[PDB]
Amino acid sequence: AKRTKKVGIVGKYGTRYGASLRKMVKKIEISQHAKYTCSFCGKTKMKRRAVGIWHCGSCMKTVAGGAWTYNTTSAVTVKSAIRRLKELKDQ
Amino acid sequence: TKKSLESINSRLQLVMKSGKYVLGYKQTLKMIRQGKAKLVILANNCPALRKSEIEYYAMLAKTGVHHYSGNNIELGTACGKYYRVCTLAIIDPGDSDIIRSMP
Amino acid sequence: VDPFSKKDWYDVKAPAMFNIRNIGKTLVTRTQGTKIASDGLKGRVFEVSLADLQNDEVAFRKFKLITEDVQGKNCLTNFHGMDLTRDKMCSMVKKWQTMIEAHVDVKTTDGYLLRLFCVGFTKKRNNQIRKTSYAQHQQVRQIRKKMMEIMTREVQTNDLKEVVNKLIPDSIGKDIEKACQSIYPLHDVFVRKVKMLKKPKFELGKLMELHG
Amino acid sequence: PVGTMPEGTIVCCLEEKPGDRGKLARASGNYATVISHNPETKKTRVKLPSGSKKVISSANRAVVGVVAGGGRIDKPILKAGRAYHKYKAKRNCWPRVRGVA
Amino acid sequence: MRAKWRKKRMRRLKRKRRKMRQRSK
Amino acid sequence: SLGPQVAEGENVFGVCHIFASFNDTFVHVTDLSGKETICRVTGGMKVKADRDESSPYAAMLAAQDVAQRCKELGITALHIKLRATGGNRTKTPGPGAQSALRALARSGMKIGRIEDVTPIPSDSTRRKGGRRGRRL
Amino acid sequence: AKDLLHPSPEEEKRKHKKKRLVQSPNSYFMDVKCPGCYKITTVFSHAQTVVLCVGCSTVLCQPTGGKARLTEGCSFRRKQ
Amino acid sequence: TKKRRNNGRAKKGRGHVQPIRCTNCARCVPKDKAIKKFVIRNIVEAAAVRDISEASVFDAYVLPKLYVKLHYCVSCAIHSKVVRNRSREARKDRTPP
RNA sequence: UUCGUUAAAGA
RNA sequence: CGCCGCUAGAGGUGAAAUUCUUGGACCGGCGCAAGACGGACCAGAGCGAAAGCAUUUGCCAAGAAUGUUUUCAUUAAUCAAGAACGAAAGUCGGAGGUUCGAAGACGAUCAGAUACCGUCGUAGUUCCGACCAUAAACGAUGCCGACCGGCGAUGCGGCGGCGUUAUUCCCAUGACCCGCCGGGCAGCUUCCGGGAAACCAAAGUCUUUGGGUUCCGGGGGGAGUAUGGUUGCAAAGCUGAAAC
Ligand SMILES: [Mg+2]
Ligand SMILES: [Mg+2]
Ligand SMILES: [Mg+2]
Ligand SMILES: [Mg+2]
Ligand SMILES: [Mg+2]
Ligand SMILES: [Mg+2]
Ligand SMILES: [Mg+2]
Ligand SMILES: [Mg+2]
Ligand SMILES: [Mg+2]
Ligand SMILES: [Mg+2]
Ligand SMILES: [Mg+2]
Ligand SMILES: [Mg+2]
Ligand SMILES: [Mg+2]
Ligand SMILES: [Mg+2]
Ligand SMILES: [Mg+2]
Ligand SMILES: [Mg+2]
Ligand SMILES: [Mg+2]
Ligand SMILES: [Mg+2]
Ligand SMILES: [Mg+2]
Ligand SMILES: [Mg+2]
Ligand SMILES: [Zn+2]
Ligand SMILES: [Zn+2]
Incomplete structure (x- = not known):
């Protein structure tokens, strides 16, 4: 049964600190509490460790990710540029 | 290359319903030791120790090796079952020619 | 004051075997003070048209030159690029054709790397009724x-002497015209620009080899 | 070292002087842009996270990539409690009283 | 007078009346 | 002094830039390198009227002054480059150049070939006028 | 007043496949005679796939949109 | 009523045409609607071509042509006399010689 | 380059 | 912006001034940095459901059309509710800020400008994530199916033609020419018929009125307003009457 229609996970905060601030904290709390697909063991056990650190459940292979998601879009752009400069004309 | 990938998926679809196959590392080990397996299929992101061990067993037993450019989730999708799989061995292809085309 | 009474005159010596080695005369401020007279002359360039370098060839296909150094009141220049005139470039662009572009970077035999272009226009065949083409x-x-493929295997195996001797009769455009007719009858394929963007070293011994 | 990498190489934790083990661009989610190499007079321009273009030597080192933990200032602190715990973790930089008051 | 600016002035009057309702419900 | 060349018969060249705008006219004699400016007289340097500094009369006066300074400094022939405000404005040349070419050819100054090196943009960067643009 | 019941054969050939009366197809079956040893192969005119002879293992019909082009000029017939 | 069947421009297949700036008033007009002509002028007026040819260096070997994509809008082109008005049976015509 | 207004009716 | 050269003015307008300059403005030559932009080629041409889409190359999936002696076998057309996109402007975060530029400040013309003209410039215009769902979103013209004139062209496939042109020479496509087929954007004429006419091969097959289906109008204002319901951060969007 759907109980909250707008606040979602932010209903633990209740009536305080503004609709816009709660709306902007909603997406990133979903991002920090969502389980991500592990790229190594193929499971969905990426549990959030401390900030910047992501930790898969099985196979214990700790990865250094973003502060709120698993891959920052800027970080993916940096990785694409680094591999492009890698295979660009052999350094 | 997409013709080759769709060919590999179609051959796996044929082996799924017509051929005889085993699933998983501990079940492919018995086949690669008994020599019943002819072709083995590795995932992209299987761990490198298990990958090197299966490659070493296959080049001892004269068994074709095929790497699968894809996560084990879509390798399980390609073999048509809802779980995931990292290692396959086609011990008897029914109507396919994976053991004929690639080696 | 009268600074032109103080200003000095040099003359420009073109590199070898165009036809001649004469371009014109330039003004030099003087060798007064800390600023030596050979300082700005190394940076001075030239944008010279033809009918004075190629022994009565076409008036377009201009050449970009840069003064490498000066040696005994004779400022010596060297190849830097090649353009075409504005009236020729804006001409032969018909409203009912297809304009095909090309551009490619390529390294020469020596340490020079040049970016050369290519332009192509379609051709109405003789006795054609359809006006579109x-x-x-x-x-x-x-x-x-x-x-893009032809220019790489010309300029990759040949340095500046051979590529300027190929740009003298436009052998590249005629080779594209030769290898083009099996696909489409394209009309007046030129190169339209080729400019330098990398330079290895000064190398006055290589400059003397450029002379002879 | 920055003399090996080409231009546009996005690095972090680079050195001011060669051999002081990482000084510039060390906070979370920051990087530097390597441009304008020089064969003679061994220098290299780097665009810092502040936007300053610093000329450094060509022998100092830098780990290739960006610092993990990016986006840390995306979430509002949203209450005084998390700010108190953050500053209790860092240092007593928080007797922030208004100078007019 | 244009129908455009007639609609826009009635729109501004609508905004003023909505603010008046929110001021004194 | 006499200049660079004694016993004439060989032309000493100069690049003459003509920047013909709809409010002023620039005639600018330079050497072949492009750095050493020989002479430069505008329309406002010859006509007091700011409304008439773009006139062909102003072009004739400025070009006669430039040709006199070039004959004093001792250069014979001129290659001519022509341009206007071509960045985003009208690419057509102004009214001054059509008479400035005449006033260079009249008082000496043997002309070589003339090229229209006008700054042509590639792909029409943002125009000053606006949506509906200039209105009277 | 056009004779629709007895039209001209040239007009019925120049009309479209299905627009005309009998709606006969414009395809046929041709008898490719490969010069290898003996084999004559019946093949559809608008052959969508490659055609491999069982004796010489050569491609007789290249796949082409429209109708299939051939190899070096083997003969054919019309069986209608 | 309909004054034109073409509604001014030539957009009949597509639905959006790029606005290209006018020359005089610099108003953005779609390019199938604006008056787009092509002027090939001589770089010297013929009243001074003969003077430059007599006072030139080369012996009549160079004659450059100035090419301009002239691009008016239909609000200033009528004032600039190019696209003057015609009658109801005269709007259907084509290019004059 | 700019130049404002003239109602009700009266065929 | 940094070097080099020359010199008194250089933008700007119908006209001048506000602006920058002997501290070197503007102009030329070289180099650097920034972001926006893809002309000419560009057409009563193409694609896409529309809005829209134009530098090269690679990758990813998608689709019309065509040729189908291919396959399934009525699986179909339109659609209350509901749902996906949806120009530009506008709103919420993040990076920068070239040009233009709402508001704003001035310089002018007029009796009066706070406007049209000029100078500077904020939000925005750019990109990545979210919202809004509006336009002269136009062909002011619902979709599907058939019929009723001709002509000359164009784009895409298919077919035929000891014609011409390119390779080295049969050989296969390339380029042009002639004709046909299908569907597509279009054009000219017509007493085919309609309509009040403009005009329309559809706006025809309608008093000789009926192929199927959806949405909407009932004199002009009030008024797309008030009041309710609902969506939205808000601007506002959807539904939307009465008195007179
Ligand atoms: Mg912030
Ligand atoms: Mg504070
Ligand atoms: Mg306080
Ligand atoms: Mg107190
Ligand atoms: Mg209006
Ligand atoms: Mg109160
Ligand atoms: Mg009217
Ligand atoms: Mg539209
Ligand atoms: Mg009256
Ligand atoms: Mg400059
Ligand atoms: Mg928008
Ligand atoms: Mg705010
Ligand atoms: Mg913003
Ligand atoms: Mg105002
Ligand atoms: Mg303004
Ligand atoms: Mg401005
Ligand atoms: Mg509407
Ligand atoms: Mg509808
Ligand atoms: Mg065709
Ligand atoms: Mg082909
Ligand atoms: Zn894991
Ligand atoms: Zn205009």
Whole structure:
């Protein structure tokens, strides 16, 4: 049964600190509490460790990710540029 | 290359319903030791120790090796079952020619 | 004051075997103070047209030169690029044709790397009634591949002497015209620009080898 | 070292002087842009996270990539409690009283 | 007078009346 | 002094830039390198009227002054480059150049070939006028 | 007043496949005679796939949109 | 009523045409609607071509042509006399010689 | 380059 | 912006001034940095459901059309509710900020400008994530199916033609020419018929009125307003009457 229609996970905060601030904290709390697909063991056990650190459940292979998601879009752009400069004309 | 990938998926679809196959590392080990397996299929992101061990067993037993450019989730999708799989061995292809085309 | 009473005159010596080694005369401020007279002369360039370098060839296909150094009141220049005139470039662009572009970077035999272009226009065949004369764009992609392909295996195996001796009769454009007719009858394929962007070293011994 | 990498190489934790083990661009989610190499007079321009273009030597080192933990200032602190715990973790930089008051 | 600016002035009057309702419900 | 060349018969060249705008006219004699400016007289340097500094009369006066300074400094022939405000404005040349070419050819100054090196943009960067643009 | 019941054969050939009366197809079956040893192969005119002879293992019909082009000029017949 | 069947421009297949700036008033007009002509002028007026040819260096070997894509809008082109008005049976005509 | 207004009716 | 050269003015307008300059403005030559932009080629041409889409190359999936002696076998057309996109402007975060530029400040013309003209410039215009769902979103013209004139062209496939032109020479496509087929954007004429006419091969097959289906109008204002319901951060969007 759907109980909250707008606040979602932010209903633990209740009536305080503004609709816009709660709306902007909603997406990133979903991002920090969502389980991500592990790229190594193929499971969905990426549990959030401390900030910047992501930790898969099985196979214990700790990865250094973003502060709120698993891959920052800027970080993916940096990785694409680094591999492009890698295979660009052999350094 | 997409013709080759769709060919590999179609051959796996044929082996799924017509051929005889085993699933998983501990079940492919018995086949690669008994020599019943002819072709083995590795995932992209299987761990490198298990990958090197299966490659070493296959080049001892004269068994074709095929790497699968894809996560084990879509390798399980390609073999048509809802779980995931990292290692396959086609011990008897029914109507396919994976053991004929690639080696 | 009268600074032109103080200003000095040099004359420009072109590199070898165009036809001659004369371009013109330039003004030098003086060798007064800390600023030596050979300082700005190394940076001075030239944009010279033809009918004075190629022994009565076409008036377009201009050449870009740069003064390498000066040696005994004779400022010596060297190749830096090559352009075409504005009236020729804006001319032969008909409203009912297909304009095909090409551009490619290539390294020479020595440490020079040049970026050379290519322009192509379609041709109404003799006794043609249809006024459009377009292409199916796959011939356009194929001829972009072909014109990018030809210039690489000319200029990759040949340094500045051979590529300027190939740009003297436009052997590259005639070779594209030769290898072009099986795809489409394209009309007046030129290069339209080739400019330098990398330079290895001064190398006055290589400059003397450029002379002879 | 920055003399090996080409231009546009996005690095972090680079050195001011060669051999002081990482000084510039060390906070979370920051990087530097390597441009304008020089064969003679061994220098290299780097665009810092502040936007300053610093000329450094060509022998100092830098780990290739960006610092993990990016986006840390995306979430509002949203209450005084998390700010108190953050500053209790860092240092007593928080007797922030208004100078007019 | 244009129908455009007639609609826009009735729109501004609508905004003023909505603010008046929110001021004194 | 006499200049660079004694016993004439060989032309000493100069690049003459003509920047013909709809409010002023620039005639600018330079050497072949492009750095050493020989002479430069505008329309406002010859006509007091700011409304008439773009006139062909102003072009004739400025070009006669430039040709006199070039004959004093001792250069014979001129290659001519022509341009206007071509960045985003009208690419057509102004009214001054059509008479400035005449006033260079009249008082000496043997002309070589003339090229229209006008700054042509590639792909029409943002125009000053606006949506509906200039209105009277 | 056009004779629709008895039209001209040239007009019925120049009309479209299905627009005309009998709606006969414009395809046929041709008898490719490969010069290898003996084999004559019946093949559809608008052959969508490659055609491999069982004796010489060569491609007789290249796949082409429209109708299939051939190899070096083997003969054919019309069986209608 | 309909004054034109073409509604001014030539957009009949597509639905959006790029606005290209006018020359005089610099108003953005779609390029199938604006008056787009092509002027090939001589770089010297013929009243001074003969003077430059007599006072030139080369012996009549160079004659450059100035090419301009003249691009008016239909609000200033009528004032600039190019696209003057015609009658109801005269709007259907084509290019004059 | 700019130049404002003239109602009700009266065929 | 940094070097080099020359010199008194250089933008700007119908006209001048506000602006920058002997501290070197503007102009030329070289180099650097920034972001926006893809002309000419560009057409009563193409694609896409529309809005829209134009530098090269690679990758990813998608689709019309065509040729189908291919396959399934009525699986179909339109659609209350509901749902996906949806120009530009506008709103919420993040990076920068070239040009233009709402508001704003001035310099002018007029009796009066706070406007049209000029100078500077904020939000925005750019990109990545979210919202809004509006336009002269136009062909002011619902979709599907058939019929009723001709002509000349164009784009895409298919077919035929000891014609011409390119390779080295049969050989296969390339380029042009002639004709046909299908569907597509279009054009000229017509007493085919309609309509009040403009005009329309559809706006025809309608008093000789009926192929199927959806949405909407009932004199002009009030008024797309008030009041309710609902969506939205808000601007506002959807539904939307009465008195007179
Ligand atoms: Mg912030
Ligand atoms: Mg504070
Ligand atoms: Mg306080
Ligand atoms: Mg107190
Ligand atoms: Mg209005
Ligand atoms: Mg109160
Ligand atoms: Mg009217
Ligand atoms: Mg539209
Ligand atoms: Mg009256
Ligand atoms: Mg400059
Ligand atoms: Mg928008
Ligand atoms: Mg705010
Ligand atoms: Mg913003
Ligand atoms: Mg105002
Ligand atoms: Mg303004
Ligand atoms: Mg401005
Ligand atoms: Mg509407
Ligand atoms: Mg509808
Ligand atoms: Mg065709
Ligand atoms: Mg082909
Ligand atoms: Zn894991
Ligand atoms: Zn205009």
